[PDB]
Amino acid sequence: PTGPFKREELLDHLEKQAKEFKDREDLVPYTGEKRGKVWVPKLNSVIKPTQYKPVPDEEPNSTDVEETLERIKNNDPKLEEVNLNNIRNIPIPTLKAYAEALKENSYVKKFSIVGTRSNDPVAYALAEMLKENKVLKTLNVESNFISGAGILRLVEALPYNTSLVEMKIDNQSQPLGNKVEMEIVSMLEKNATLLKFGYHFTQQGPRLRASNAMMNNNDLVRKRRLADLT
């Protein structure tokens, strides 16, 4: 329209505008005058906290995203643990590529993507991956920006999966919603394999349904440990 923004012209105009508005002289001055009736009725020490024992920091996650993705694509036998926690600026197609590559990988048993700003496409892709992959044991998607729809799709993948034992989904940026929570526990009652589900429920109903489902699955573990004892 008018080309590149000329900030100096705007500032000059604004200052010109300000110069031309002088104040008015119709102000009744504030003197603090009381015109109504005044009503008449008829060792210190600053304890500072010091519980913060400064346990040291760690070392930033040195994983090479490209190299690791290449190893997962190559089905590298030496690669069992993939930890992509707290790595800055991982593209959404890169995470989707990770999820696509993990479908046929025979060797990665733990996968986590905490605090990588992952959203619903990533969760959808991971959901698709979980229907096919038969080796992955641990999935941690905590502390991201995945909505209720992504989580729903994830748990809708669970009856086509018999290998995952831990799903951590807690501390998403938005509450999942009561309706979604109901469909989630409903799906949890239709899988006998998952042993830990990381999520702070809001409603006591699904909370207890989930608790009973997990106790049931662990008791199936107990009973098969008892039956195989000759």
């Binding site: 329209p1 500032l11 000059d12 119709d26 009381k34 009736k37 009503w39 619903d120």
Partner: protein, 371 residues
């Protein structure tokens, strides 16, 4: 005998006459004092400025906000705002007119007492009353039951109300409102290459906010549309004739209300605080709360905010619920409008605290009257 209605907010004073359909005076809440660019505070020259004058000579005036997050904290500067409101904006003699004031949710007892003391002892008004903002909004809406979302320039509250009895334990306050949204819009315009960091430019930024921003129904879809095409962009003509183009800033800016991490602040969004407020209220009355979500205040004026709120509450609540969001077009001054309906009633005459009642009872009467 005509009553006055003064609604003092964090950003704007709205003041006028009971019975009118809109406030006659609307002006910012900024006390402006001489700076030290040259010499000290000159004696005899006007030692303070309010509203428009303080928003004009801004460059040489330290601006203050006497009310901070809806609570009166500088009583001298409050009394100043009030004096200027009576004498220099409405142009009335206060002793001839009953004056209705508003207060924030969960305003401390001592503030109500001090407000009462100032109204009777300084300005010698014949009568006064103090009504709770959110309650006035629900009154104006025509209902006796609902949860108010009141969001202005400085503070947002959720106030659940059932059959005339508000619920103090369930009120939620979020310190995120219009001024934060202006700051965020300024930041992302600076990011795009429009560096509006002067106090002069601030007005322009506020105008862009009030005219071109909207709440997206599905944010990430909108972001993809804005990245994939120019179909959501708008031109804006600046006061000097320059024309700028803005894109996803239109809907990134009010998204902060739903996602406060955009400005750092780790609080829940207004949909989550709304839900949490409802969940602190007893199981029985909850259903009614869901059916009467009333939006009040200027920061609820963004197009599309009702549909987005409807979606988030719908997905956050049990499916069986009837969810309804009520967003009157006149909600920007609805509090004032509520006051206008309030004083105009034939039944309101005996509700005022009179001067004689104050002179007999003292500060006490404000709580010991209509609570």
């Amino acid at each position: 005998t005509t009553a006055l209605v003064c609604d003092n907010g964090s950003g704007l004073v709205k003041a006028g006459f009971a019975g009118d359909d809109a406030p006659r005076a609307v002006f910012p809440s900024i006390v402006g004092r001489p700076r030290h660019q040259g010499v000290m505070v000159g004696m005899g020259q006007k030692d303070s400025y309010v509203g428009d004058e303080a928003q004009s000579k801004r460059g040489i005036l330290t601006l203050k906000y006497p009310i901070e997050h809806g609570i009166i904290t500088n009583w001298d500067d409050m009394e100043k705002i009030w004096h200027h409101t009576f004498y220099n904006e409405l142009r009335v003699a206060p002793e001839e007119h009953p004056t209705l004031l508003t207060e924030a949710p969960l305003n401390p007892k001592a503030n109500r007492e001090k407000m009462t003391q100032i109204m009777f002892e300084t300005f010698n008004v014949p009568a006064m009353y103090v009504a709770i903002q959110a309650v006035l909004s629900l009154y104006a809406s025509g209902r006796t039951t609902g949860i108010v979302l009141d969001s202005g320039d400085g503070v947002t509250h959720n106030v659940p109300i059932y059959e005339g009895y508000a619920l103090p334990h369930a009120i939620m306050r979020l310190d995120l409102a219009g001024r934060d949204l202006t700051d965020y819009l300024m930041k992302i315009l600076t990011e795009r290459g429009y560096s509006f960091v002067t106090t002069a430019e601030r007005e322009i930024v506020r105008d862009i906010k009030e005219k071109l921003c909207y709440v997206a129904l599905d944010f990430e879809n909108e972001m993809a549309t804005a990245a994939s095409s120019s179909s959501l962009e708008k031109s804006y003509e600046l006061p000097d004739g320059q024309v700028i183009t803005i894109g996803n800033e239109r809907f990134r800016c009010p998204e902060t209300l739903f996602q406060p991490s955009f400005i750092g602040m780790e609080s829940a969004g207004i949909h989550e605080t709304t839900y949490n407020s409802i969940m602190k209220c007893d199981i029985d009355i909850r259903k009614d709360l869901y059916a009467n979500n009333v939006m009040s205040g200027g920061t609820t004026m963004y197009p599309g905010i009702a549909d987005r709120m409807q979606k988030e509450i719908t997905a956050l609540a049990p499916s069986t619920m009837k969810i309804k969001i009520i967003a009157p077009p006149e909600r920007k001054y609805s509090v004032w409008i509520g006051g206008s309906i309030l004083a105009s009633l034939s039944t309101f005459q005996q509700m005022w605290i009179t001067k004689q009642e104050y002179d007999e009872a003292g500060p006490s009467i404000v709580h010991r009257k209509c609570f």
